[PDB]
Structure 1
């Protein structure tokens, strides 16, 4: 597996691997332990493969959002920074590296979109989204546009969509509710309507993508763009006198970009967890260590307070941190994949006029949340099935058979559950009386007085279950379940034995 007595570190090729290796050299000088910094290809996919088999690097550097997935597969050790060390980093960066209620990585850097503007065309950039239409008219009179940025990817359009109330997944305690998506609320509609209005009023074109926007800003054709630190060096080569500042407000509220946090995780299979902790806390996450990495290739804004104070001398870095603090931590759960595709489709459909804003987002809410909502409903239905089977078994323990009588019916009326026209189980032990009945339908348990094994439960759910949903029931039980009437009133019968 992983060789003890040493540190293998994986970081992406676009980061400062030379500087990190120099921090490694200071570590080997003080301790004798060699540090191998490599930047292999496809590092994001290679780690989950090799780490599951109990191999790989000791420390993996990657954007925090993948780490929640890694943690679910148990590939990451819980880190143990003392309170004194935690206060050296901005509190909001620690929230980006939590899964369950556990710290699962060290925050390194902080990144978010900003407003980039051409100082020659526009020495005072607009504070509000609302004033950009008038600005575009005044600039189109001189052959220039106000604002071009990538409209094809919801990462770039989300700051406006979220400003008045949009969100990806609600965050509560230390967990995301994968059932609560904020794509079709009034705030998200208002933000997307403003975006579409900009396009219908000819202030932007629905076909603008990353390359068109970057080319237009670099050739001084548009006064503003929206982009991240990765784009700065191509504007330097362009020689355009540019600035970087806070994103415009919408309805008086800041734009809310997604925040990406470069993070260092410790492989759960590492026999060098103490060495890795010592390296990350007392060598890398210092002014001297981050300086080493930044001088090789800049980090942007950093989570370490002391060095951020120094990098923030650069107003572009200060703006990145300000937009980040006003933004939304990108959720670190794998359910974001459905979020990205859903919102990407909605924006493209609404911007090109192929759908209304309401239809686009209603569909997107569905595409992002429906599967997870049903999965919860199926699980609660299966909980009821197991609860009914449990009580039926408990009855046999004390009484002759499964049911006392022949049949029992649960039906839900208007917020209450009714049982025949008389109480059945007749107990203080069972009764259950805690069936969610997630599809509000009817349950009917069947038995015939005699030799046992005739335990059949008939469920008549109200509400269409998906193919994926009904097929989950087929893999969970097998030949013991008969879905009849695949249309109208679907009927499900399970033999509880």
Structure 2
């Protein structure tokens, strides 16, 4: 529980502990505040309970969309924006960490999809989505694929579906309209059609997994694949003439990858809300603070412009940073969880031939607004 002179943070154990703890130690060193980092397996169940008990964790780590649900669950207090930091960071990142016009988190790091290709097979990737299928046919002759997906999550499909003018929710006047989706939109039909053509014409395998395809990429069996800046895939800092670039764009359209932003929320019920608030912004994402914490991660791919500039010198990052500024911010709205389910079902039924595109997308928007 929360103690006087203490703060408790829960962050994905997979790689959560090392950086956060060392940063907590720095803040613990300065103020004497005892920091405690734990691994969040229980959080989903604890979330409602700790709030009801007026005392659980102080700070909650960001998921994908779920953090927005956490805001709706009142797991975070209203936060005050730092104008100086805004300049030091990026503008587009702030939308992801704001909800109902209020600041619910700080942007620490930026994740976006990018095209990862073998320079030896393809020295020049496609500039647009139209070029891919023609490009794929040529390298299909060599037993390569141009584009990778496994249709195990809607995350994979979105790049194709939204590319033609699709979108989760409409934003206007600083507010999202729950009644205005771009998932039942004509553009969404075109994007999903692209997916079907890729599978039907055997440009990509419907059953092949991301781990299998990434392994095939690692061996040069597949020319190109899609992943974020982490390049964890199934390999470590590769050296064999692999490269990273931005995703294709079609006829001047919003054809670019979605953007996720690392976020943190501060328990409103916490007696130590001020301790959490001050250190969060001043350590987790600053010139001094971010530098220390990134030491545990490979690249960082960070929301901090200054530190980003230096690490952005890697081909792996530079494309992700560019397409982050040109990509589309992933909504933090709780209904995004329904958007996840809504797309996944719609795509599978379409690809399996069980349901038509317009009908599946009609079901997709129905689920979101229901």
Common fold: TM-score over 0.5: yes
Deviations 1:65-102 (A, max 9, x none): 22322222322111123322333221111111112221
Shift of 1:225: 0.9
Relative to its length, the structure with more strand (as a share) is 1
Deviations 1:204-234 (A, max 9, x none): 2332332332232223211111122344362
Deviations 1:395-448 (A, max 9, x none): xxxxxxxxxxxxxxxxxxxxxxxxxxxxxxxxxxxxxxxxxxxxxxxxxxxxxx
- Distance in 1, Cα, partners of 2:91 & 2:127: 27
- Distance in 2, Cα, partners of 1:271 & 1:77: 12
**2:13 counterpart SS class:** coil
- Distance in 1, Cα, partners of 2:127 & 2:44: 38
Unaligned runs of 5+ in 2: 362-370
Deviations 1:74-133 (A, max 9, x none): 221111233223332211111111122211111111111111111111121111111122
The higher radius of gyration belongs to 1
Shift of 1:254: 4.7
* 8 Å contact from structure 2 (residues 10, 61) kept in 1: yes
Deviations 1:159-204 (A, max 9, x none): 1211121011112233322222212222111222222122222212
Map 1:200-215; keep pairs closer than 5 Å.
200-215=200-215
Shift of 1:247: 0.7
How many equivalent residue pairs? 361
* 8 Å contact from structure 1 (residues 106, 263) kept in 2: yes
Shift of 1:285: 1.5
* 8 Å contact from structure 2 (residues 78, 102) kept in 1: yes
Q: 1:42 to 1:156 in 2, by over 3 A?
A: farther
- Distance in 2, Cα, partners of 1:339 & 1:158: 11
Q: 1:123 to 1:176 in 2, by over 3 A?
A: same
Tell me whether 1:348 sits opposite 2:348 in the alignment. Answer: yes
Deviations 1:292-325 (A, max 9, x none): 2211124632112221112211221222222222
Shift of 1:32: 1.9
Shift of 1:261: 1.2
Q: 1:45 to 1:326 in 2, by over 3 A?
A: farther
Deviations 1:39-88 (A, max 9, x none): 23244543443234222222222136223222223221111233223332
* 8 Å contact from structure 2 (residues 61, 264) kept in 1: yes
- Distance in 1, Cα, partners of 2:108 & 2:24: 16
Q: 2:26 matched to which residue of 1?
A: 26
Once superposed, what is the RMSD of the aligned Cα atoms? Answer: 2.3
* 8 Å contact from structure 1 (residues 247, 254) kept in 2: no
Q: 1:53 to 1:64 in 2, by over 3 A?
A: farther
* 8 Å contact from structure 1 (residues 255, 326) kept in 2: no
